[PDB]
Amino acid sequence: SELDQLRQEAEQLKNQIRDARKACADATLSQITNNIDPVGRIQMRTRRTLRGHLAKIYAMHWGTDSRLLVSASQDGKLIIWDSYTTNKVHAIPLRSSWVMTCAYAPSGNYVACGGLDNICSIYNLKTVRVSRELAGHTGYLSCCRFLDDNQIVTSSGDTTCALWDIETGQQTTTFTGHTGDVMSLSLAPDTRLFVSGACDASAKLWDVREGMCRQTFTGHESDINAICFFPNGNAFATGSDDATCRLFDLRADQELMTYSHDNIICGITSVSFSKSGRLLLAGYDDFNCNVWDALKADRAGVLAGHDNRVSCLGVTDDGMAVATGSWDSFLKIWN
Amino acid sequence: SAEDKAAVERSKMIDRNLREDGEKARRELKLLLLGTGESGKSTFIKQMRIIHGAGYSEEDKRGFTKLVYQNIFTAMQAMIRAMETLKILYKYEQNKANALLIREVDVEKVTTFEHQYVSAIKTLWEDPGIQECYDRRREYQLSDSAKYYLTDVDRIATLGYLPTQQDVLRVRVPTTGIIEYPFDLENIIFRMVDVGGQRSERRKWIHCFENVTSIMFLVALSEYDQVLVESDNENRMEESKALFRTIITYPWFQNSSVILFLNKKDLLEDKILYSHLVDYFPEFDGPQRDAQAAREFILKMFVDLDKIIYSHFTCATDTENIRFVFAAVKDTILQLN
Amino acid sequence: ASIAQARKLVEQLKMEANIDRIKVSKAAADLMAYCEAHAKEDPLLTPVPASENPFREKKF
Ligand SMILES: Nc1nc2c(ncn2[C@@H]2O[C@H](COP(=O)(O)OP(=O)(O)O)[C@@H](O)[C@H]2O)c(=O)[nH]1
Ligand SMILES: [Cl-]
Numbered sequence A: 001s002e003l004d005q006l007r008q009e010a011e012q013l014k015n016q017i018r019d020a021r022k023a024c025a026d027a028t029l030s031q032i033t034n035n036i037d038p039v040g041r042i043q044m045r046t047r048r049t050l051r052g053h054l055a056k057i058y059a060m061h062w063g064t065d066s067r068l069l070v071s072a073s074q075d076g077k078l079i080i081w082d083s084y085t086t087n088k089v090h091a092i093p094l095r096s097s098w099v100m101t102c103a104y105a106p107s108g109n110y111v112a113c114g115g116l117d118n119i120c121s122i123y124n125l126k127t128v129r130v131s132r133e134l135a136g137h138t139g140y141l142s143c144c145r146f147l148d149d150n151q152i153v154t155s156s157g158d159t160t161c162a163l164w165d166i167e168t169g170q171q172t173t174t175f176t177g178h179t180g181d182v183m184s185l186s187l188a189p190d191t192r193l194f195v196s197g198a199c200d201a202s203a204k205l206w207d208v209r210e211g212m213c214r215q216t217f218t219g220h221e222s223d224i225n226a227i228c229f230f231p232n233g234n235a236f237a238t239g240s241d242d243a244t245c246r247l248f249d250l251r252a253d254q255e256l257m258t259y260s261h262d263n264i265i266c267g268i269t270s271v272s273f274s275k276s277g278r279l280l281l282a283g284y285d286d287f288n289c290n291v292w293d294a295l296k297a298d299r300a301g302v303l304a305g306h307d308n309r310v311s312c313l314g315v316t317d318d319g320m321a322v323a324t325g326s327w328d329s330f331l332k333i334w335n
Numbered sequence B: 001s002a003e004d005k006a007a008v009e010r011s012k013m014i015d016r017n018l019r020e021d022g023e024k025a026r027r028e029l030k031l032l033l034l035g036t037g038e039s040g041k042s043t044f045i046k047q048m049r050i051i052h053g054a055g056y057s058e059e060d061k062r063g064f065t066k067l068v069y070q071n072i073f074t075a076m077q078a079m080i081r082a083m084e085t086l087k088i089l090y091k092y093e094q095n096k097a098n099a100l101l102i103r104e105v106d107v108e109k110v111t112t113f114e115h116q117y118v119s120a121i122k123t124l125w126e127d128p129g130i131q132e133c134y135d136r137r138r139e140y141q142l143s144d145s146a147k148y149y150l151t152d153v154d155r156i157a158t159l160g161y162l163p164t165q166q167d168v169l170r171v172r173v174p175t176t177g178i179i180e181y182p183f184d185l186e187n188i189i190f191r192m193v194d195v196g197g198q199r200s201e202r203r204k205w206i207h208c209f210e211n212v213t214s215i216m217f218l219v220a221l222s223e224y225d226q227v228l229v230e231s232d233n234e235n236r237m238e239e240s241k242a243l244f245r246t247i248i249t250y251p252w253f254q255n256s257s258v259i260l261f262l263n264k265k266d267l268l269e270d271k272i273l274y275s276h277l278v279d280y281f282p283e284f285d286g287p288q289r290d291a292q293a294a295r296e297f298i299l300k301m302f303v304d305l306d307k308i309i310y311s312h313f314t315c316a317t318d319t320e321n322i323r324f325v326f327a328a329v330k331d332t333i334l335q336l337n
Numbered sequence C: 001a002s003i004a005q006a007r008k009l010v011e012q013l014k015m016e017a018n019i020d021r022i023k024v025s026k027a028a029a030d031l032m033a034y035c036e037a038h039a040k041e042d043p044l045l046t047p048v049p050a051s052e053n054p055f056r057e058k059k060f
């Protein structure tokens, strides 16, 4: 059978990949980092409470000025906040309140959001008016991130990601290969690559300009809800339904470390590294953020300031602060 | 700072707008329609637009034209497939070629109803073999509006065809995103929501619906004689009931009022004359050929599982019936809230 | 139908197989070196003076 021989060859190739990865696994990260000092207790304070949303917050994204941020809620509003003063700068009424993601363009000129409408809507902050509705996904918009004012990458419950030309409203490139809903994406620092995490329990590394999947990583049969790059672009971390964060190395082409406690069994919604990469912060369904030592795997601290799920988080580009957003309708800024 | 003071006043003006919007949001009631495909959800939404919204103008009707054509092709493609699967013969040799022509239509791209295709459709529909296959539709998936459109193919094929309100009520509007239709009634905003077009993993978005005001669960009464061949001959109505049970036992719907609409009561009245409920549910002890006995049995079965379930029989394509039933349901929902 | 999907999977697996990989020991040393080189620049790890923290300044 032609289909049986192709099925057999795919099994041979999966073994070849398994064996090549084993050949590189000469020591573990934990062994390599054994002698570095612990970070010791991380004890951040709530510096700001951002009040104004009237329903669950699903997403947030910092502006590149480390000062303005955008948040999205099932109250049908995107709010742009000045974190330093807590002043609201804009409140944008959404046509669809069923929002799952938002993004701040690096220029500060636009924001984006979408969700169960299957559309990535772009809003012009220097005009506030909807400037584009990007239609083409056939399932929910789970995540979006601008490359520039004319290009945005999206992930979808339709199992694809896409790169869009905002002016034309078309998908330039469709990234196919996941077999389950894609939940999250993260752009490499150099914007050459991005990673996606999906309900097929895999993370995929994609070449933005070439359109292909370069590498696939398995996340142990748990949905990946959140994904983030390590700051040098050579590794990334995932957060999954099974209460576990995982670090993956691109050049060694494998998982290096897990971060979990047996007495935490709830889902992870969100992940981010600190500016140096030493801390991995994750948001949990149990209403807390846990801060992990990325090199040594010990928990370094907690952020406990919410009365419902922590749905989203983000670390400023200047490294100065963490934002948490929550189903309790509040954001908090910590450091 | 003048600039700093202006930024504070801008923030306060935004807070005013958010408070106003919050006041309005407290007047909103979310009605989540649930139920398997073909149960009546999209038709119910269209009726709300007819009864309590802007209805359908000439221009609106014109917009639905190509979808009427697509429903026709989809129906005939289903019957062509069933001829092969059930091994039923065409009476007319010409229908071999007609079936191939229709089979190869890309329905998504249909914007016209050209003479070539109209002739093929009519000749297929008039074949006694296709009529025999139509009579065996409980064994496959065919729209309950297929016969309606095919009977009226001449009207639909005429140059200048404008869809009727019934044509609109019956047409499939394809979408794989969320459907929300809000309407005003008595200073309340009803937000009617249908997720049945979504093909993605429900676990990732079901929490978007925590504590909705009301769940309206639609069941086709007419599916009592259909079995799922893949699910150990599970009756389709047993699958609908299992879905219903998952809904009513879901922890974040415990505060939601639950309204069960046993829809397609008109189709039950016809089917019960030839397809016997006792063959599918041998516990049934009522007379044969008796629609009232059958629908009473189906109701008692569906809710044979603390929580109160309200229920009504409906015909979702009958505007007067939906006007009557929803008047009562609105009273219940408002009293509870 | 399925032969096309299956060929696509094989081609993808060949692409994934035929990459240059480094030792985990090197990969780990490089992550550790990065963290060490950037630790002083990381306010969440290495507290900055109150006057440099915009969220503590009485200014705002
Ligand atoms: N005769 C009849 N047709 C109905 C009734 N309810 C719905 N339909 C039709 O059956 C088809 C499927 O119903 P639809 O509302 O699309 O179900 P959905 O898949 O849940 O949205 C459409 O052509 C409807 O107009 C009913 O009570 N009687
Ligand atoms: Cl009622």
Ligand SMILES: [Zn+2]
Pocket: B310, B311, B312, B328, B329, B332
């Ligand atoms: Zn009632």
